[PDB]
Amino acid sequence: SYDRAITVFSPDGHLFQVEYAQEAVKKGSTAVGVRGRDIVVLGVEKKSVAKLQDERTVRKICALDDNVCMAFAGLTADARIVINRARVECQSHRLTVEDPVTVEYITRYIASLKQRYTQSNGRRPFGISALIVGFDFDGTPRLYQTDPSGTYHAWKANAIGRGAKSVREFLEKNYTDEAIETDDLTIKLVIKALLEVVQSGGKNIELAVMRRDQSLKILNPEEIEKYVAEIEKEKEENE
Amino acid sequence: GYSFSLTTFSPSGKLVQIEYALAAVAGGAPSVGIKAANGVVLATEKKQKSILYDERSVHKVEPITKHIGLVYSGMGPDYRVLVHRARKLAQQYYLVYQEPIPTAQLVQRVASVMQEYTQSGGVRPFGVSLLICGWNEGRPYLFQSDPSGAYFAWKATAMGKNYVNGKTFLEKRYNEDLELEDAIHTAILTLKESFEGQMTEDNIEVGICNEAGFRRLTPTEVKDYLAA
Amino acid sequence: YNGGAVMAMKGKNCVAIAADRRFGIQAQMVTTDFQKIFPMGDRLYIGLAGLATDVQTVAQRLKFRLNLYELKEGRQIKPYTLMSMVANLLYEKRFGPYYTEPVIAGLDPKTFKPFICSLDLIGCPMVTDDFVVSGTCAEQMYGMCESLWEPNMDPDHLFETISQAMLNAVDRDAVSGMGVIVHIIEKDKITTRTLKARMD
Amino acid sequence: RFSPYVFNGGTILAIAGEDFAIVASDTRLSEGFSIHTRDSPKCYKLTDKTVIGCSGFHGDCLTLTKIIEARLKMYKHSNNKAMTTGAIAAMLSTILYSRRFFPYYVYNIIGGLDEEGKGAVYSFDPVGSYQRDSFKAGGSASAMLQPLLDNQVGFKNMQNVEHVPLSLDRAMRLVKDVFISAAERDVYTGDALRICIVTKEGIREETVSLRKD
Amino acid sequence: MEYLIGIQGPDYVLVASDRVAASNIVQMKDDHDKMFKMSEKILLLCVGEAGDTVQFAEYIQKNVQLYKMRNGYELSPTAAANFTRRNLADCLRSRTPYHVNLLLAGYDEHEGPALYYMDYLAALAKAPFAAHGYGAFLTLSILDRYYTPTISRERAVELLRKCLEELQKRFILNLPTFSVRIIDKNGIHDLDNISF
Amino acid sequence: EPGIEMLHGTTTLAFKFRHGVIVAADSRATAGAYIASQTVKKVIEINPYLLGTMAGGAADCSFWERLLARQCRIYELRNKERISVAAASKLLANMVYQYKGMGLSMGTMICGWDKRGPGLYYVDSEGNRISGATFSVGSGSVYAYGVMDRGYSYDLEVEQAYDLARRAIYQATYRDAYSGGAVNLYHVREDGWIRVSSDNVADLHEKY
Amino acid sequence: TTIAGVVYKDGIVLGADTRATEGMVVADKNCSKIHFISPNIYCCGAGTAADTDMTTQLISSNLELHSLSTGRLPRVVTANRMLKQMLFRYQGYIGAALVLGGVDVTGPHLYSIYPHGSTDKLPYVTMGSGSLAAMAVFEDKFRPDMEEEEAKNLVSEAIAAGIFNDLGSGSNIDLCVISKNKLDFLRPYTVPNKKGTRLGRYRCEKGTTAVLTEKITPLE
Amino acid sequence: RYDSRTTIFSPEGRLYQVEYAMEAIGHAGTCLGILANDGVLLAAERRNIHKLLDEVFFSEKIYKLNEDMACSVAGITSDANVLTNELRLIAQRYLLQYQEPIPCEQLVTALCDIKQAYTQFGGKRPFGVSLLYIGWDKHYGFQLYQSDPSGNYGGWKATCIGNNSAAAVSMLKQDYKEGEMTLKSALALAIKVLNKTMDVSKLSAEKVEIATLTRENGKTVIRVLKQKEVEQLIKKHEEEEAKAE
Amino acid sequence: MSRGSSAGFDRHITIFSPEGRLYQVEYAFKAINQGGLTSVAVRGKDCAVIVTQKKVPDKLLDSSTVTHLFKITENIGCVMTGMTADSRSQVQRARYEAANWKYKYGYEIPVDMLCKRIADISQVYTQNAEMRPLGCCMILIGIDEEQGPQVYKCDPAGYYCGFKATAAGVKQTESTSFLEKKVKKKFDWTFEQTVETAITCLSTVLSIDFKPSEIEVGVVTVENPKFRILTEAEIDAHLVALAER
């Protein structure tokens, strides 16, 4: 196929725009999340170091609301537009159906928008996939992961973007109840997971957790260098 | 390929379509605009191939206000449309603001209006470049409008056929020191340098803009200056 | 309705302008620090009077449009240019009339020439060489100027005369008054003074 | 100026039985103080089982009945089945309310059977708030009619009397008598009488003569 | 109608509202809050035509929360004040019933507390102290006489209590209970209502 | 009347003692001076989760609350769980906020026992949306408020609450010329409202 | 306001006053001078002064650009039609009053534009508040084919009668002469009223008024 | 598989059209900004080799936006004109809506949103321009933002766009300091930068744009540096490499 | 959205050539000569006259219904060359155009202004993507106020000018040559040694002597300014006068 009717079915049916945007997230920076017993960690690398940057602006991690954060991968500006639209919808729900929205509802809204960038020759498909995570109305941990197709599956813990697979089949090989009992080990799994893909050490991996019912707390470059604190956990106790 | 759309850049991020418009401008008629300490003169060539043509049913240099003159180098009808509707813009500016538009905001207007054609698709870029003569608070202004929407202010410039040699000729023959009356003569000299066809009275339309505002030169006056 | 008044008189390369400070809902003062005069340039001010909503609306919208104009032209606006500017803004909302009567006081950015002008509520300038007033107590204020003015006023006398005019006038209007602010635009510096007005 | 509404008069009566639902209306169509015609019925058959009765502004009556016919055909086409009487009532409610800001000046009563085989009468207001009822009168003389219906059908304010169910013959006699009684005090009633008897085996029409004054 | 009041101290703003809504003569909720939580340090007091008040207030609610989440930082009370003034003035020419008289109060880390009077004409005005509703007529005098630009929270509360007692002495309507909150460096603080 | 008055409101009732909410209302359409009907049920079975109330205008109340029923079932499908009382009140208030000043005369009360427990909100034509412990609207609402205020107790036992509702509704219809008909009692117990009874004022007078 | 115009032998001599009356109070002693748009089509107007002014600007613009497109001088009838159709559709709205005059290839012309769009070609019309008195003066003393100075005089007394015999009119007399060749800035032609000498010598004394706060802002 | 009309993906998901747009950026005049502890300074290159040019007034690539910010541009110049007009429009409209100056992040976001939207539904060409932003707000102090036709953007203590830009930043990041970067030292080292990345032609006072952002007395002040200080700095430069040997 | 332009230089008008020459305009120009007709327009000090063939290659036709002189106003007329249908349409267009002119400005449209407006309409076609240029050239005659007669001719390109004498059609180059020769030397042209010379032109350039059934002539005169068409009752007499010399 070529230009017109930008979303055309393939001769077998392989809607080219879909997997074409799918490929867009393999050059996207690798992100990951874990749904823990009472904490949820949201880790992502930034292997475009450009150390003459302001890290504040180039976070991957955005927060949707009092009860939701996310990370993504792919075309950053498109993701920013997604985030703003989702924030608006979340505010509208909290006004009209007033309650803290559940993670599933906002994920379903995201998926509906994402898949409704498939009609209307017009609009082109979005080139992002998201890791929506947050604590519900009840305080249970939740996790949801989508793709440009429009599907909005949920995972125990998943990774997207560059080399996402290797992280995934590291993850089930190590995801267990005696890995999430402690929050420190909970984040340590993510640490090791990106260690498998990071630019050789705790280099520019930005992450934050959301413990139950308080806030999104930015895991920061503390005096201990929170990052390299857990990093050295693995350095000197992985033997 | 990658040179048919106006909507996609080249593999080198380099707009072939605008360049084709530029080449069309180069293929137009010679034109000269000379700034001077007391005015600005615009000169250009009339190419009425047959004497059956009338010079002066239609015109090459068009007034816009008391103190605005336009001249081009390209395909006439594009110039005529742009004049007709830059007039709309200036007339706005006077309607909203009880004072004639300064030349700058006019060339802002015009640059915007042509550029939007470049970035629309399905519409060809305006294949013609423009020259502007103006007089604001009593001091002369000289603008050249690039069909890409670019606009440049020049001490003096020349466009149309063989305009590179014209610009070089101007380089070694103009100074900020000049006045209007000799500016007319030197601009005529510039056109004569690259006229290819033996100046008569009736080949150049001349327009000037001083404190008394922009106004053409009658063919009587063209003869009158060419006498010496 | 809300009440208030503005005024400006010219002079020897010096213009004066003044407006009261009362903000009251049609019978009752709300506060005595309400803004009616607004700076539109280095040496150009506008004073509003009328519905407080239209005052604070026209002022903000003029700030908007004039800032856009300044950035576009890159030059400080002429007083006559601003006059025609505001002459339009009231007019587009013709059948929504902004209930306000602006006045303008300013100088030439090239010569510091004295200049004042006023507008009707839909825009019809009175380019006056001596004075304009607006608001509720227009007639008293006209009366004060019509005698108190004199040609070729040096700035101190100009300030004294505007002070006396407005203090005599607004004292006689029920809905306006309660404090008078005064600005003096001279060729170089700006003086803004507050006046011991009957605060009743 | 121009008045878009006018009161054409007329009275519509419905009674629900066990195997029947009598609808009742005269044909005295008037305007101002003049009789237009003596023979304009105010009860229309919709389906084999449902009969509507309308009163009031007669132009609205015509428009409403024609649009009801149209919607009946639409529903038939869309769902391959005769539209149920209760569905008819709900549809009439919504369609009448569609003109919330320009009301159809019409009073409506629906006569028909349920699909359980029993009689059922729906009463309405000019805007569409309906309710199932065992009996109802609408129109100008509905004021005269209603108390007697309450007294006999509802046995209201009776004492020490068996509440025998209303049989078809008794209902027929009662409706004839109540319109005969109405004809002599109301001005908009008379000149004829149309009676529709909706049963399980179809619809048969009945008509008599009233006071022609 | 109802009654709202704001008092600004050297470093705080104190607000108070009555807690009764009416239909014709009745007071359906005796425990009604007419005062909304704009954001962490900004409180909004609303009154006016029934229906419009809550709708407009929560419209501003969603706007300001969306602003905070879009930017991370916090909207200044002056900025939200002007924003409400615009969102109210624009609707004046296209919403005939939109009566909302407002007292927007809050604190800013830079310029200290700031209290804003807001007539339904959307004519914003700074005030060292202000009030809406009918009872403002009877009370603004008392609030004037015993006011100083500097007042510790204790004298502020006592002056407010004097105001409310004056209402219960003179005002013809029945306003038995009033909600009181104070805004300072440490968020808003709920204060015990004024029962009689 | 050119077909549009529809009501002016007659004698509703609702409160939320510690065994769920009970509601009560009469049944007497007052077409001006002439009764339209004696048997107009005013409690509206929106769903087996939540009960409305007709007052102020018959057609508007019925139509808008039926539309609410559609909307809330849509909500329960999309979210897979029942809508809360507060959310339903919000939906009704937003729906009726438009058409402001066009003649709407709604006076509904939304009642239900959602996850937050008892739920009771007053939603009317002009946009008031307030919760509370005690409510009644209509012409006889004043008499209802009297008797109710003197009967109410959050710890009142269920049967005595029924007695309170019956007494209040009966006194209000006894004074009002515009309220009348048979009284209806609906108890919203734990999940799923339960119809209590539909007794007649004439018999109540003997009982009283 | 009282405006009038005539068609003398070789042009039009418009007349106007300069008393702006905001209500029953003089808005301007020297009202924004009532002559207007681009050459040989000067017009004067009255009514809702603002709209007269801004309508004149609009038509001036729309017609000037037309002429520039033409390369020929505009015609009176052109502006006449434009004013027709614009003072039309906004019928039942503000509109304005106008006296349109000019001297094109077809010689002098003079139409009298009305708010709804009533116009008419006349040798003489009077509009404003004192239009009645001005018309009286004309009908008393108008004879066809007056000379330039004769027409100027005639309009002088025409405006003067309105000045001295009306409440909403009277100030400097303004004359507007347009001919096939020439054009005059008679601004103003003659002033009958002079402000009386101020016998008071108040000479506002310094320090007359107490001042609370004196804030100074040097700029240069 | 095929590229056209700014709305179709290649079988890698990255937009060809915008990547082409970031090629004239590689041809546009070199433009760089430096974030100082107590100011912001910005450099750019003139393509104005022609002596017949005039009217250098007030800028030639430094477009001023609000009361306190200005931007810089590289790419299709008329595209830039439209972008700058639009930027000023929303900046002033934000002020209208809030009576506060636009925070730099908000303005950059609001612009790159439109830039991205032109990489969306439609088909008309995207803006072939990369923008630099210098400004200040009460929230964050001095900030410096880069813009990308893709809508991507970022805060930089130091960045460059234009030809040789990769080399320029390559030297910068081995040269820039954490927070002892004073205005004059930053000027000097920026001039060293521009000298080294500039093409074969000897560096001249007549090819640089130097404009600075400073604060005094509660006001934010932006100047376009006059010539005289430009030869001052450049001759200073040539003599402190007279140290370099 | 729409079918779009076929990809190619000559495939569609909007695309410029490497030298930015509009091919489809040339295609229109050499599409004019379809129909074989060639028209000539000359004007004197008193009259402006336009003459063309009347090809009737069928006598099932009615000579009345076939024509190329279409009165536009009672004062202004025109001639057509090119395909028939687009000429139909532009005749309609200009009739409407001049009527609107008179309605909106109150006086008869000048010839030059009508020509300009028609040229604008033709030009805007060369701007769009599914416009096709109206492949026909249209020539005017009339007396304005003082300039006596004028002759004007727009074209699909939008170019127009005032001509002392002009022609269009197949033998256009030869017509122009003979026109130049005649105009240089003999130039009085009152009414008979006048445009009758252009009839001589048309005959000489085209064929043997004509007899009037093939000729269609319309005139406007300074002393009698109606657009009005002579017949074989008239044109015959003219041409017998011409045959004798």
Q: 10 Å Cβ neighbour count for I22? A: 23
| Cβ contacts of I106 on chain G, cutoff 8 Å | 75, 77-78, 80-81
Write the residue in E89, E121, E126 that is nearest to C31 by C-beta.
E126
Catalytic residue among F10, F12, F53, F173: F10
What's the domain range around H207? 1-245
Fold of the F10-208 domain: Glutamine Phosphoribosylpyrophosphate, subunit 1, domain 1 (3.60.20)
Would you call F59 helix, strand, or coil by DSSP? helix
Q: How many structural domains compose chain H? A: 1
F87 interfaces chain E, CB cutoff of 8 Å: no
E strand intervals along B10-125 = 31-36, 39-45, 62-63, 69-74
Region for E116 from its dihedrals, namely left if φ exceeds 0, alpha if ψ lies in -120 to 50, beta otherwise: beta
Interface contact flag, F79 A105, Cβ < 8 Å: yes
Amino acid at site G89: R
**Closest listed residue to residue F8, CA positions, set F125, F90, F91:** F125
Residue (of B2, B54, B40) closest to B215 by Cα position:
B40
SS3 E85: helix
Could you give the CA distance from residue A83 to residue A74 in angstroms, rounded to a whole number?
A: 13
**Closest by alpha carbon to H201, among H51, H49, H75?**
H49
Query: How many structural domains compose chain D?
Result: 1
Contacts of H26 in chain B (CB under 8 A): 13
Q: How far apart are CA B7 and CA B122, in angstroms?
A: 9
Chain F residue with minimal CA distance to D91?
F63
DSSP A143-201: EEE--TTS-----SEEEESTTHHHHHHHHTTT--HHHHSSHHHHHHHHHHHHHTTSSSS
- Per DSSP, the residues of B201-217 read STTEEEEEEETTEEEE-
Say how far apart CA D1 and CA C124 lie, in whole Å: 41
Which of these, D39, D9, D13, lies nearest to D179 by C-alpha position? D13
Cβ-defined contact of H82 to B142 (cutoff 8 Å):
no
Q: How far apart are CA A201 and CA A191, in angstroms?
A: 10
Calculate helix-pair angle for G148-164, G131-141, nearest 10 degrees: 140
Burial of C16 per CB tally in 10 Å (0-12, 13-18, 19+): buried
CA G110 to CA G4: how far, in whole Å?
10
Integer CA distances (angstroms), B136 to B38, B94, B142, in order: 11, 15, 11
Closest Cα in chain B to H55: B153
Domain residues for the domain of E153 are 1-196
Among candidates G112, G108, G102, G186, which has minimal Cα distance to G149?
G186
Choose among E71, E83, E86: nearest Cβ to H106: E71
Q: How many residues does chain H have?
A: 245
Cβ of A20 within 8 Å of Cβ of H173? The answer is: no
Backbone conformation region of residue H46, classed left if phi is above 0, alpha if psi is from -120 to 50, else beta = beta
Residues of C in contact with B137 (CB under 8 A): 110
Query: What is the gyration radius of the CA atoms in chain B, in angstroms?
Result: 18
What b-and-e string marks burial along A132-157, b requiring 16 or more CB atoms within 10 Å of the CB?
Answer: bbbbbeeeebbbbbbbbbbebeebeb
Q: Does H139 touch chain E (CB under 8 A)?
A: yes
Q: How far does the CA of residue I165 sit from the closest CA of chain G (Å)?
A: 22
Contact H125 B171 (CB under 8 A): no
- Alpha carbon distances (Å) from F3 to D97, D122, E110: 12, 18, 62
User: Phi then psi for G165, rounded to 5 degrees?
Assistant: -130, 45
Q: CA–CA separation, F102 vs A2, rounded Å?
A: 54
Q: Show residues of chain A in contact with F91, CB under 8 Å.
A: 96-97
* Contact in structure between G203 and G190 (CB atoms under 8 Å): no
Bridging pattern class, strands F34-37 and D106-113: unpaired
The number of CA neighbours under 13 Å toward the Cβ of I213 is: 5
Taking CA atoms, I203 is separated from A75, I138, I200, I243, in Å, by 73, 21, 5, 11
**Cβ-based contacts of E73 with chain H (< 8 Å):** 139
3-state DSSP call for residue C33? coil
**Domain total for chain I?**
1
Chain B residues lying within 8 Å of G71, measured CB to CB: 59
Contact F126/E at CB under 8 A: yes
For residue B154, which residues of chain H lie inside 8 Å, CB to CB? Answer: 50, 52-54
Cα–Cα distance for residue pair H46/D173, rounded to 1 Å:
107
b/e per residue H163-181 (b: at least 16 CB within 10 A): bbbeebbebbbeebeeeeb
Distance CA(A163)–CA(A26), nearest Å, equals 7
CATH number at residue H95: 3.60.20.10
Name the residue type at position E76.
S
What's the start-to-end Cα distance of chain H, in Å?
A: 55
Is the bond preceding D4 in cis, omega lying within 30 degrees of 0? no
Confirm if D135 and D152 have CB atoms less than 8 A apart: no
Chains that touch C (3 or more CB pairs under 8 A): B, E, G, H
Specify the CATH number for the domain of residue C114. 3.60.20.10
B60–chain G nearest CA distance, Å? 13
Tokens of D183: 């004809």
Q: Per CB distance under 8 Å, which residues of C are interface residues toward H? A: 60-61, 63-64, 67-68, 71-72, 74
What is the Cα–Cα distance from F107 to H74, expressed in whole angstroms? 64
C44: containing domain: 1-200
Helix (H) or strand (E) run with residue H224 in it: strand H219-224
Chains H and G are touching, with contact defined as 3 or more CB–CB pairs separated by less than 8 Å: no
CATH code: domain of residue E90:
3.60.20.10
Using an 8 Å CB-CB cutoff, list chain E residues near H97.
82-83, 86
Instruction: State residue C189 phi and psi, 5-degree precision.
Output: -120, 165
- Write phi, then psi, for I30 (nearest 5 degrees): -85, 10
Helix, strand, coil percentages (3-state) for chain A, rounded to 5, are 35, 20, 45
* Per-residue b or e along E64-100, where b marks 16 or more CB atoms closer than 10 Å to that residue's CB: bbbbebbeeebbbbbbbbbbbbbebbebbeeeeebbb
Taking phi over 0 as left and psi of -120 to 50 as alpha, with beta for the rest, D147 belongs to alpha
Bridge partners of H35?
Answer: H40
CB half-sphere exposure, H148, CA atoms < 13 A: 17
Compute the nearest-CA separation of A22 from chain E (Å): 28
Rg (CA), chain I: 19
The length of chain D is 213
Joined together, the tokens standing for residue C158 give 């100009």
User: Tokens at residue E81, please?
Assistant: 């004040």
Instruction: Give the 3-state secondary structure of I150-162.
Output: EEEECCCCCCCEE
Answer whether B5 sits within 8 Å of H4, measured CB to CB. yes
Candidates A96, A99, A105; nearest CB to F94: A96
* CB atoms B122 and I14 under 8 Å: yes
**Yes or no, beta carbons of A95 and E70 under 8 Å apart:** no
Q: CA of E63, closest CA in chain C: separation in Å?
A: 21
Inter-residue contact D38 to D192 (CB < 8 Å): yes
What b/e sequence results for G77-97 when a residue is b if at least 16 CB atoms lie within 10 Å of its CB, and e otherwise? bbbbbbbbebbeebeeebbbb
Mutation site, B87, B89, B205, interface G, largest G CB count within 10 A: B87
Residues for chain G: how many in total? 220
Which chains reach chain A with 3 or more Cβ–Cβ distances below 8 angstroms? E, F, H
CA distance C51 to C23: 10
CA dist., res. F33 & res. A235, Å (int): 90
Q: What is the DSSP string of F99-163?
A: TTTTT-----EEEEEETTEEEEEEE-TT--EEE-SEE--STTHHHHHHHHHTT--TT--HHHHHH
Number of domains chain E contains: 1
Residues of G with CB under 8 A from a CB of B: 57-58, 61-62, 64-65, 68-69, 71
Task: Tell the CATH topology of B1-228.
Answer: Glutamine Phosphoribosylpyrophosphate, subunit 1, domain 1 (3.60.20)
Residues of E in contact with F127 (CB under 8 A): 50-52, 54-55
- Angle (CA) H16-H18-H23 rounded to 5° is 95
Question: Does F165 appear as a known binding residue?
Answer: no
User: Buried b / exposed e across H182-205, counting CB within 10 Å, b at 16+?
Assistant: ebeebbebbbbbbeebbeeeebee
Torsion on CA atoms I220, I224, I226, I227, rounded to nearest 10: -10
A-E interface (Cβ pairs under 8 Å ≥ 3): yes
Helical residues (DSSP H) of H28-153, grouped into ranges = 77-98, 104-117
Task: State residue A169 phi and psi, 5-degree precision.
Answer: -80, -5
The residue with tokens 């007899």 is: I211
- Chain C CA closest to residue H68: C71
Using DSSP's 3-state secondary structure scheme, residue B29 falls into: coil
What CATH number is attached to the domain comprising A130?
3.60.20.10
Give SS3 for H179: coil
* F117 closest CA partner among F37, F191, F176, F39: F191
Distance separating alpha carbons of residues A204 and C84, to the nearest angstrom:
57
> How big is chain A, counted in residues?
239
Distance CA F163, CA F145 (A): 15
Contacts of F80 (CB under 8 A, 6+ apart): none
Closest by Cβ to A98, choosing from F75, F79, F86: F86
HSE-up of residue D118 (Cα within 13 Å, Cβ side) = 10
Instruction: Check H11 against A21: CB less than 8 A apart.
Output: no
To test the contact with chain H by mutation, choose from A29, A53, A121, A204 the residue with the greatest count of H C-beta atoms within 10 A, namely A53
Identify whether the C-beta of residue A33 lies closer than 8 Å to the C-beta of residue A154. Answer: no
Distance CA B203, CA B46 (A): 5
Resolution of the determined structure in angstroms stands at 3.8
Asked if C32 is an interface residue toward chain G (Cβ–Cβ < 8 A), one would say no
Chains touching G (at least 3 CB pairs under 8 A) are B, C, I
The closest alpha carbon to C86, from G132, G50, B4, A219, belongs to G50
E strand residue ranges, D38-177: 43-45, 50-56, 106-113, 119-123, 131-133, 135-139
Integer Cα distance of I149 and I143 in angstroms: 4
The question of whether G48 is a catalytic residue gets the answer: no
Q: What domains appear along chain G, each with residue ranges and CATH number?
A: 2-190 (3.60.20.10)
Structural contact between residues A53 and H154, judged by C-beta atoms closer than 8 angstroms: yes
Dig out the tokens for F186 from the structure: 């609906």
Phi, psi values for residue E125, rounded to 5°: -160, 125
Q: Is the dihedral of CA E64, E65, E66, E71 positive or negative?
A: positive
φ, ψ at G84 (rounded to 5°) = -45, -65
